[PDB]
Amino acid sequence: LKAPVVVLGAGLASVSFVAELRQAGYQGLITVVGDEAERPYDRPPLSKDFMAHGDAEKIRLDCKRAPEVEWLLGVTAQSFDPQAHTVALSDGRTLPYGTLVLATGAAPRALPTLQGATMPVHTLRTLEDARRIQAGLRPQSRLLIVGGGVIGLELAATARTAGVHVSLVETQPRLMSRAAPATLADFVARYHAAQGVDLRFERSVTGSVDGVVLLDDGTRIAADMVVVGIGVLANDALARAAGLACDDGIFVDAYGRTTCPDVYALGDVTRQRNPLSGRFERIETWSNAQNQGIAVARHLVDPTAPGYAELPWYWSDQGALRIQVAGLASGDEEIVRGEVSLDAPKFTLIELQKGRIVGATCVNNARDFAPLRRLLAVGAKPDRAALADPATDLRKLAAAV
Amino acid sequence: LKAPVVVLGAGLASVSFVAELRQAGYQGLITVVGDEAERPYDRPPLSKDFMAHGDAEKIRLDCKRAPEVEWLLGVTAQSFDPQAHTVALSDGRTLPYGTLVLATGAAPRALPTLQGATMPVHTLRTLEDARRIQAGLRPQSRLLIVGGGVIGLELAATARTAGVHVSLVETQPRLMSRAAPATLADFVARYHAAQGVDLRFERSVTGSVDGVVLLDDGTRIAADMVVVGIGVLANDALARAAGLACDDGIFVDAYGRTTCPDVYALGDVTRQRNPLSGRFERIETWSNAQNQGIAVARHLVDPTAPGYAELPWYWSDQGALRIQVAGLASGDEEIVRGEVSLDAPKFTLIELQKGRIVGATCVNNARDFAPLRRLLAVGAKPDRAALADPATDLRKLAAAV
Numbered sequence: 001l002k003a004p005v006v007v008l009g010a011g012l013a014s015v016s017f018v019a020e021l022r023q024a025g026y027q028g029l030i031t032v033v034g035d036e037a038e039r040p041y042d043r044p045p046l047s048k049d050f051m052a053h054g055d056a057e058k059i060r061l062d063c064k065r066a067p068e069v070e071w072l073l074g075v076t077a078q079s080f081d082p083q084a085h086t087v088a089l090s091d092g093r094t095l096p097y098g099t100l101v102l103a104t105g106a107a108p109r110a111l112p113t114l115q116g117a118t119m120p121v122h123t124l125r126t127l128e129d130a131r132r133i134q135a136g137l138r139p140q141s142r143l144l145i146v147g148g149g150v151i152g153l154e155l156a157a158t159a160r161t162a163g164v165h166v167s168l169v170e171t172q173p174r175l176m177s178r179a180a181p182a183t184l185a186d187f188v189a190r191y192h193a194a195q196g197v198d199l200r201f202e203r204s205v206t207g208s209v210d211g212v213v214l215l216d217d218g219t220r221i222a223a224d225m226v227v228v229g230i231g232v233l234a235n236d237a238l239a240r241a242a243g244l245a246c247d248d249g250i251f252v253d254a255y256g257r258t259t260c261p262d263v264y265a266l267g268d269v270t271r272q273r274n275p276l277s278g279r280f281e282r283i284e285t286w287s288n289a290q291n292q293g294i295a296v297a298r299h300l301v302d303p304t305a306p307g308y309a310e311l312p313w314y315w316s317d318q319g320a321l322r323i324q325v326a327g328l329a330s331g332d333e334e335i336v337r338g339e340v341s342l343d344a345p346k347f348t349l350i351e352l353q354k355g356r357i358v359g360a361t362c363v364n365n366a367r368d369f370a371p372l373r374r375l376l377a378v379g380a381k382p383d384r385a386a387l388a389d390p391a392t393d394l395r396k397l398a399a400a401v
Numbered sequence: 402l403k404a405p406v407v408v409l410g411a412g413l414a415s416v417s418f419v420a421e422l423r424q425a426g427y428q429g430l431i432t433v434v435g436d437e438a439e440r441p442y443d444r445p446p447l448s449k450d451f452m453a454h455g456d457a458e459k460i461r462l463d464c465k466r467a468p469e470v471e472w473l474l475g476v477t478a479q480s481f482d483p484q485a486h487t488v489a490l491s492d493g494r495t496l497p498y499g500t501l502v503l504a505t506g507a508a509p510r511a512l513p514t515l516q517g518a519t520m521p522v523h524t525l526r527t528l529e530d531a532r533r534i535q536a537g538l539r540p541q542s543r544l545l546i547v548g549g550g551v552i553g554l555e556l557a558a559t560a561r562t563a564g565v566h567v568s569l570v571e572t573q574p575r576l577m578s579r580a581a582p583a584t585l586a587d588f589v590a591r592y593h594a595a596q597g598v599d600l601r602f603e604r605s606v607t608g609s610v611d612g613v614v615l616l617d618d619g620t621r622i623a624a625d626m627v628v629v630g631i632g633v634l635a636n637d638a639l640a641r642a643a644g645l646a647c648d649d650g651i652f653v654d655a656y657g658r659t660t661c662p663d664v665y666a667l668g669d670v671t672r673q674r675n676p677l678s679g680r681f682e683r684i685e686t687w688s689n690a691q692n693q694g695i696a697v698a699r700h701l702v703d704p705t706a707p708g709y710a711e712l713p714w715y716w717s718d719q720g721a722l723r724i725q726v727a728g729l730a731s732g733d734e735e736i737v738r739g740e741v742s743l744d745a746p747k748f749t750l751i752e753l754q755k756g757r758i759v760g761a762t763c764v765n766n767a768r769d770f771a772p773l774r775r776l777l778a779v780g781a782k783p784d785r786a787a788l789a790d791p792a793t794d795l796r797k798l799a800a801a802v
């Protein structure tokens with residue numbers, strides 16, 4: 001930790017990091033560069049309640065635990081020189097740094113086959129994006145969503161609630177293949193289909209002509225608007241240019257260190273060790289941005305502190321489904337607590353590997369999620385008969401560990 | 402570049418690195434720690450002429466361009482403390498360092514299904530390994546090789562030349578799936594089959610009982626000796642323990658930097674950017690160990706020097722086949738120069754992507770390999786009709802670029 005500190009990006013990872021720097025006792029300069037001209041804000045509401053109520057003043061991040069920070073909003077960091085220890089800004093200024101933190105997030109992947117489209121085609125990452133999409137959610141209009149991942153499905157539910165007709169094209173044979181157990185994804189598809197979403201599995205978009213999207217089975221889907229949610233790409237261009245190790249994401253260790261001295265990285269832009277798989281992955285979650293920002297700041301101020309150690313988890317709100325997912329999507333065994341039913345959906349899934357909990361899912365069952373995250377953290381090996389048995393309560397199981 | 406320099410590992414990457422340090426003009430201390438009690442030696446001969454003639458004094462590396470280096474042979478580095486800047490040795494000594502270089506290579510993967518075997522099962526990486534295997538190559542004995550990669554096939558050819566019966570089990574539908582064009586691998590299989598090797602594709606070993614190996618199709622193969630060549634795993638344990646970013650290999654940038662200040666890594670142990678794919682990969686070649694060692698040393702002595710930039714290539718000697726392979730195994734087009742024939746095999750393959758050369762193969766055609774590596778390096782886009790046409794000579798094509 002050398003002053004001054006400069007952070008590039010003003011999203012959750014950045015705000016969480018700089019708040020922790022202050023709270024841990026660092027009193028030197030902190031400057032944050034954010035390319036969006038927006039008071040820092042949280043993204044999860046964008047495909048959820050914001051989409052419904054439209055009040056951006058309900059989604060702002062709390063920067064009050066980060067006193068004495070200069071936020072340069074609406075400014076783009078164009079490059080940095082890690083020898084000179086400087087950052088070049090789009091407004092023509094240069095910032096010096098002792099420690100540089102890259103917290104620049106990720107951007108939606110574009111669909112190459114719609115690049116020449118003559119119909120609206122949007123992606124959803126920013127407040128500007130959400131406002132643009134929401135304005136097009138005219139009741140009785142037709143929306144096509146490309147991609148059956150979390151953003152696509154949250155938008156699908158939002159659009160159906162709004163009275164919009166929804167079709168959805170997914171290249172895989174299932175939804176949410178990235179980070180969800182098969183049992184969850186099968187149920188989720190039954191849910192969306194029951195709510196009127198026209199799901200097209202094992203299909204791809206091949207092009208579009210005069211307001212109509214073309215598919216690889218030689219068929220057509222007419223739509224008024226297309227939203228593409230086919231994943232993200234790390235915003236790692238400054239790091240690539242400056243000579244850091246990166247591959248769709250900046251490689252970092254548990255201290256947040258890049259391969260370049262005095263340069264760190266946090267949040268969606270990083271590729272990092274998942275302790276449960278033991279492999280490097282991009283972890284594209286809200287809880288990672290917050291918790292990794294906090295851990296890296298803490299260790300910078302106090303090098304005796306441990307490196308980042310938290311295990312991954314996320315949630316998704318898709319209409320009537322409040323989905324929570326921790327750890328790995330599969331092991332060698334799955335245990336199902338409750339009935340999997342479209343009538344008052346409520347269940348929990350537990351993934352085991354040789355008797356040890358490696359992942360858990362809760363659908364409309366928030367009470368079970370915290371105990372299971374604690375069992376997961378210690379790699380508990382509970383009685384499998386007990387885990388299934390509905391009589392068992394999980395909180396007491398966790399507390400006994 | 403802070404003195405003293407300590408390198409862990411005494412293989413090609415280490416010798417190449419320390420020779421370049423001296424030649425570039427660094428005059429400070431250099432100490433090399435090597436766990437093998439052997440004068441530093443090259444590995445490619447081990448499955449080639451050494452296997453045939455057995456003289457280790459023909460395979461030693463030249464350490465004379467590395468004057469004033471203390472080589473601690475037969476010593477294992479057990480850990481390093483990157484805060485204290487020290488390395489703990491198996492003989493109870495500690496070394497201080499200004500710059501630490503991890504050049505510890507990779508180890509053969511074991512076969513889990515033969516772990517309890519009661520018959521000889523060997524892998525081939527070291528001089529000790531090669532000596533042990535060679536002693537078992539009794540004429541008219543039966544060898545089973547597990548793995549249809551380069552080491553397995555070079556051993557297969559060696560063993561057939563020695564009068565040994567060879568069977569070979571490969572899980573994939575083809576040989577050399579890791580880094581060879583399909584056209585090459587199809588030919589190579591025809592060659593080995595013609596030389597008497599019993600090839601078993603899309604099979605795995607499930608176990609062994611009383612001298613007989615069991616397969617996943619429910620069948621059996623009797624053998625006197627098993628050699629396992631199913632790939633390697635990076636020797637990255639010290640880096641993992643010390644908190645560096647690693648995932649079956651230490652992540653490094655083009656300067657050789659790890660995520661830990663003052664610690665670098667080189668050779669088989671690294672995961673690095675392949676400039677042709679733009680992805681991070683372990684590059685497990687002789688030319689990488691040498692050229693990456695040289696580039697990293699050069700840039701340490703002279704920070705104005707460019708980072709490592711060479712494109713990948715290797716060769717394999719399999720009986721009558723002198724195979725050379727550069728760049729990517731495939732693109733969107735392959736061009737075949739010459740006839741692919743078991744009678745006096747001699748041909749070249751050229752892989753293109755949108756007209757640009759991205760890879761090349763020469764079989765018994767060394768004269769063409771250097772010109773093609775030069776065309777590849779600049780991403781030439783030669784006349785495809787000309788590349789095919791036998792009248793064209795490639796050296797002049799390269800020189801014109």
Ligand SMILES: Cc1cc2nc3c(=O)[nH]c(=O)nc-3n(C[C@H](O)[C@H](O)[C@H](O)COP(=O)(O)OP(=O)(O)OC[C@H]3O[C@@H](n4cnc5c(N)ncnc54)[C@H](O)[C@@H]3O)c2cc1C
Binds near residue numbers: 010045078104316
């Ligand atoms: C619609 C949507 C729904 C989501 N729902 C959930 C959810 O329910 N649960 C969950 O766990 N996760 C959810 N997420 C993911 C979560 O929001 C992200 O993991 C989190 O935003 C990552 O934070 P970050 O700080 O790393 O990156 P970001 O939030 O992307 O912030 C990075 C900022 O840096 C800026 N930047 C980039 N380059 C430069 C530059 N050169 N100069 C200046 N600034 C730059 C970017 O424009 C951006 O403003 C959702 C995301 C979206 C978009």
Ligand SMILES: Cc1cc2nc3c(=O)[nH]c(=O)nc-3n(C[C@H](O)[C@H](O)[C@H](O)COP(=O)(O)OP(=O)(O)OC[C@H]3O[C@@H](n4cnc5c(N)ncnc54)[C@H](O)[C@@H]3O)c2cc1C
Binds near residue numbers: 446477669716717
């Ligand atoms: C049989 C065989 C055939 C090959 N044929 C070819 C070929 O024809 N063409 C080609 O391009 N490539 C070939 N290769 C690959 C090539 O030899 C390697 O790419 C090269 O050896 C990598 O060099 P290196 O210095 O990175 O690692 P290594 O040669 O593995 O050297 C690393 C050294 O560090 C030692 N070490 C590990 N941990 C410690 C520790 N804690 N303390 C001290 N020492 C440690 C290791 O034991 C080893 O001696 C072949 C390899 C083998 C084994």
Ligand SMILES: Nc1ncnc2c1ncn2[C@@H]1O[C@H](COP(=O)(O)OP(=O)(O)OC[C@H]2O[C@H](O)[C@H](O)[C@@H]2O)[C@@H](O)[C@H]1O
Binds near residue numbers: 147151230
């Ligand atoms: N060309 C394509 N056509 C159709 N579907 C595609 C295509 N390419 C990928 N897909 C599918 O799109 C889906 C993308 O899912 P996610 O990776 O969850 O991506 P997205 O929903 O865009 O969200 C990106 C990120 O932001 C949120 O934090 C979200 O949790 C995710 O981490 C996957 O099911 C994938 O199979």
Ligand SMILES: Nc1ncnc2c1ncn2[C@@H]1O[C@H](COP(=O)(O)OP(=O)(O)OC[C@H]2O[C@H](O)[C@H](O)[C@@H]2O)[C@@H](O)[C@H]1O
Binds near residue numbers: 550571606
């Ligand atoms: N369980 C298995 N059973 C049978 N075959 C397997 C199995 N697992 C992997 N294989 C096959 O084994 C082969 C291993 O090939 P390489 O990766 O070339 O590994 P190996 O020949 O052991 O050599 C390791 C390294 O040393 C040399 O430098 C060589 O070039 C290579 O880089 C591949 O064709 C792969 O499909």
